[PDB]
Design a protein around this nucleic acid. Structure first.
Lengths: 62, 380, 96, 121, 132
RNA sequence: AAUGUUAACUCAGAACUGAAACGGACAAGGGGA
RNA sequence: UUUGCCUCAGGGUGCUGUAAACAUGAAAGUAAACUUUACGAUCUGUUGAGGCUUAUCCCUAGUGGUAAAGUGU
């Protein structure tokens, strides 16, 4: 089976749980739940959001 | 005079009185019917609160907008700590109802079952079923001959074994399960081989059939009308509170009718859920049982993080449509359907795509702890 | 008087009561636990013990206190409740 | 029981009744003290001690005054009274007038300025 | 042209004011009724995308104001379910002016648009600006 | 035209920062036709 | 009501989130001596790590305890 990758998050997406959010621009935005979209819709940055793999890439700790 | 604006009554009168159930198990009023043409097999099963989850599927109903496209569904995966068959009951029809002729017990009875006959087992002499299990086989042959000659309904006394479950309770739950089939003279042989052992499901439980669930709902104690029957709240200006029914009856009849919603017990009710179609057959130990050839990963019925307020599941699994009433650790009774159907979904062949394995407690992030370890590698 | 090792989780004992009764509920639960454990109706809390669990405030008594309790031979029996302190309870299993 | 003794002892240290202290034991020796002179000698030998008023330091804003001199809170949002309420502008005008009249008096003591160019300024 | 229309979570009751997100000249819609709504005593009719909505234009062209028109609500600020394993929702509340027959009265919709109605009324498929 | 002792709280712009958020509690007009 | 239970602890799962310390480290720029020396919202490396986590979460023949047996028939 094929699972996609999230926009803010990076883990695979399992159908049967999800939601979808779209902004005014018409761009597609995919995540996993309201907690996986809350700070995204609240204009936050994944470079400062510590607890994802984006901060790892922005602090070179791989 | 008439109401200005009509609206349907609050709650259903078919579930009255809304009082506490007298027992904890889910008792069955009626078993599925039997027919002359049909061949002799089993009738029902039982277990504990097992899990009602999703499973990914695909419609094939001609003319839907999903059809070929993937769908997500909802069904249940059921639990079977193997029930032990210990007794046989014969019932015969009379104008006063269906009446017991006799019950015959197995030559050897377990201790979990014996514990149910006591309120203080720890302090007792454990004398139950001590001199009634050493009767000669002659009485058995002398009365089982009467069973077929006079009785029309046969039931098997079976009991659960909570020791295979994380339950604190040690007494077994006891029930009787009917046996169905056609003509009486074909039952004498078929009711003579499986009279002691435990219960493997796969003999009768098969894909593409319907079954029902019966249990006791959760308890909530005494609750008001607003929660018991969902009546309209009164406006905030109300003098002596707003969480009540304003008019509990007209002047005449000069009494309160039984149809008026009132405060009282809600929950801990006895309920049966219908129209649940069974879909898949599985086991407890086997490794390729729940997932499919499209996913070919490694995981099974096994849970993750521990089942909140239950524990860990170490018994069999199947697949059945629906979701289930009652609280965690509650005994659930599984009956078959009373009459099968022949419609589109009735004859529709069923097959899944993917099965969840995650931390069903709360919002966790990892499904298999193997991937949990691997994706993180060298940690503290 | 018997040598033992156990603690008392005051969180699970005061977790239900309101702000204004947390510390007195901890006192009452400590007395009840000591009495039930030592099989004596005569239980005496030490003034230092009362000091300790009222120090952090009424709203929040200490989460945990380590007990290894000693009875006293002088109806005929009575107990005095005491404690043992440690920087980290981690690894401090029960024993004799 | 020990209410008369407490009342009388309150008149010896000239303190309140809530300021009389004993030892944890010997809690009957004040009943034995039927005369203030006993508490007096007990006080001399050191078992009556008015509890010291609890620790109330001051440095928390003693540092903060120098911090606002430093100028982090010199934004426009720690002020609660009006411009006049903090410093009275009438008082400011009075201060300025006194300062300039003193200087105009000094300048005429030193005769740096004549009357003609004194009144004009 | 077929009526297999699927379930959706309910939002935007009567009296809601939403954006227009179309070039017809209206700015906002004020919802006065949703069609297909039956009889529940104190229930407020709430908006469904596959159903039309009766609305009035409060801000916009005078030729569009002071009358009751039909609108199809496209973008919602409440999560609505799908069989795709995920719901679908947005940040704005928006709806496009259409005629009772179903086809659009403008020509373009600014933001993303609802695909469920574009084959309910086949002309919105042709007039679809930027589907998500 | 100059250089020494000693007592304000008003302004200002550059920073960076901190969970793009702040008379942080208390106290304290809803406006318009 | 002694392959049980209570308790504690170990572990698990989580919850917020990186928890104390180190700093001739940076640390806006600040002040004191003949290049060095008195603060500084934080990060940086241990730190995707502490505190809490059943009281109605899960596992553990881990261990401390599990007590007097009164009433009716």
């Amino acid at each position: 089976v094929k699972t996609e990758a999230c926009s803010f998050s990076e883990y695979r997406i399992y159908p049967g749980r999800g939601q979808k959010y779209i902004a005014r621009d018409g761009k597609v935005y995919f995540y996993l739940s309201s907690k996986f979209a809350s700070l995204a819709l609240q204009k936050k940055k994944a470079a400062k959001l510590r607890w994802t793999q984006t901060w790892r890439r922005n602090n070179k700790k791989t | 005079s008439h109401r200005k604006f009509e609206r349907p009554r609050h709650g259903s009168l078919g579930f009255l009185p809304r009082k506490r159930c007298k027992r904890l198990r889910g008792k069955i009023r009626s078993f599925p019917k039997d027919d002359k043409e049909k061949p002799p097999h089993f009738t029902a099963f039982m277990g504990y609160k097992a899990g009602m989850t999703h499973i990914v599927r695909e419609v094939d109903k001609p003319g839907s907008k999903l059809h070929k496209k993937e769908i997500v569904e909802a069904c249940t995966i059921i639990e079977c700590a193997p029930m032990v068959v210990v007794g046989i009951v014969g019932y015969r029809e009379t104008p006063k109802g269906l009446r017991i002729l006799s019950t015959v017990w197995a030559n050897h009875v377990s201790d979990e079952f014996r514990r149910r006959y006591y309120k203080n087992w720890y302090k007792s002499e454990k004398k139950a079923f001590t001199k009634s299990l050493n009767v000669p086989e002659a009485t058995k042959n002398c009365l089982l001959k009467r069973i077929e000659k006079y009785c029309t309904v046969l039931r098997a006394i079976c009991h659960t074994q909570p020791s295979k479950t994380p339950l604190r309770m040690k007494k077994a739950h006891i029930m009787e399960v009917q046996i169905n089939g056609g003509s009486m003279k074909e039952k004498l042989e078929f009711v003579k081989e499986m009279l002691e052992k435990n219960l493997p499901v796969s003999t009768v439980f098969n894909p593409n059939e319907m079954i029902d669930v019966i249990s006791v709902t959760k308890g909530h104690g005494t609750k008001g009308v607003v929660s018991r029957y969902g009546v309209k709240r009164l406006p905030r200006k109300t003098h002596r509170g707003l969480r009540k029914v304003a008019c509990i009856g007209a002047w005449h009849p000069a009494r309160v009718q039984f149809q008026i919603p009132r405060h009282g017990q809600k929950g801990y009710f006895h309920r049966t859920e219908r129209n649940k179609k069974i879909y898949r057959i599985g086991l407890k130990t086997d490794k390729n049982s729940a997932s499919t050839d499209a996913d070919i990963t490694e995981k099974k019925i096994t849970p993750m993080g521990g089942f909140p307020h239950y524990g860990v599941v170490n018994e069999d699994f199947l697949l059945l449509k629906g979701c289930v009433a009652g609280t965690k650790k509650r005994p659930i009774t599984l009956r078959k359907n009373i009459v099968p159907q022949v419609s589109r979904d009735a004859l529709a062949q069923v097959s899944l795509k993917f099965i969840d394995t995650s931390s069903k407690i709360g919002h966790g992030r990892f499904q298999t702890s193997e991937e949990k370890v691997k994706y993180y590698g060298p940690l503290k | 008087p018997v040598t033992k090792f156990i603690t008392i989780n005051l969180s699970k004992l005061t977790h239900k009561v309101c702000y204004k009764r947390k510390a007195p509920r901890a006192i009452k639960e400590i007395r009840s636990i000591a009495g039930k454990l030592m099989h004596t109706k005569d239980v005496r809390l030490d003034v230092k013990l009362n000091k300790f669990i009222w120090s952090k405030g009424v709203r929040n008594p200490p989460k945990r206190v380590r007990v290894k309790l000693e009875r006293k031979r002088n109806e005929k029996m009575y107990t005095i409740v005491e404690h043992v302190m440690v920087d980290s309870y981690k690894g401090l299993v029960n024993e004799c | 029981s020990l209410t008369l003794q407490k009342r009388l002892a309150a008149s010896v240290l000239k303190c309140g009744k809530n300021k009389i202290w004993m030892d944890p034991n010997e809690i009957s020796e004040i009943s034995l003290a039927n005369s203030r002179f006993s508490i007096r000698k007990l006080y001399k030998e050191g078992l009556i001690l008015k509890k010291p008023q609890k620790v109330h330091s001051r440095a928390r804003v003693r540092l903060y005054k120098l911090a606002k001199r430093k100028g982090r809170h010199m934004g426009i949002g720690k002020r609660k009274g009006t411009k006049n309420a903090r410093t009275n502008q009438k008082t400011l005008w009075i201060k300025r007038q006194r300062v300039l009249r003193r200087l105009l008096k000094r300048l005429r003591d030193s005769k740096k300025v004549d009357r003609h160019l004194y009144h004009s300024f | 042209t077929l009526k297999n229309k699927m379930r959706i979570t309910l939002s935007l009751p009567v009296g809601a004011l939403i954006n227009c997100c179309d070039n017809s000249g209206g700015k906002n819609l004020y919802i006065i009724a949703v069609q297909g709504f039956g009889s529940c005593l104190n229930r407020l009719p709430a908006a469904s995308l596959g159903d039309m909505v009766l609305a009035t234009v409060k801000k916009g062209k005078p030729d569009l104001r002071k009358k009751v028109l039909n609108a199809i609500i496209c973008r919602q600020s409440k999560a609505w379910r799908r069989h795709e394993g995920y719901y679908i929702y947005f940040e704005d509340n928006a709806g496009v002016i259409v005629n009772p027959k179903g086809e659009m009265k403008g020509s373009a919709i600014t933001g993303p648009v609802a695909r469920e109605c574009a084959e309910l009324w086949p002309k919105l498929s042709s007039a679809a600006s930027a589907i998500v």
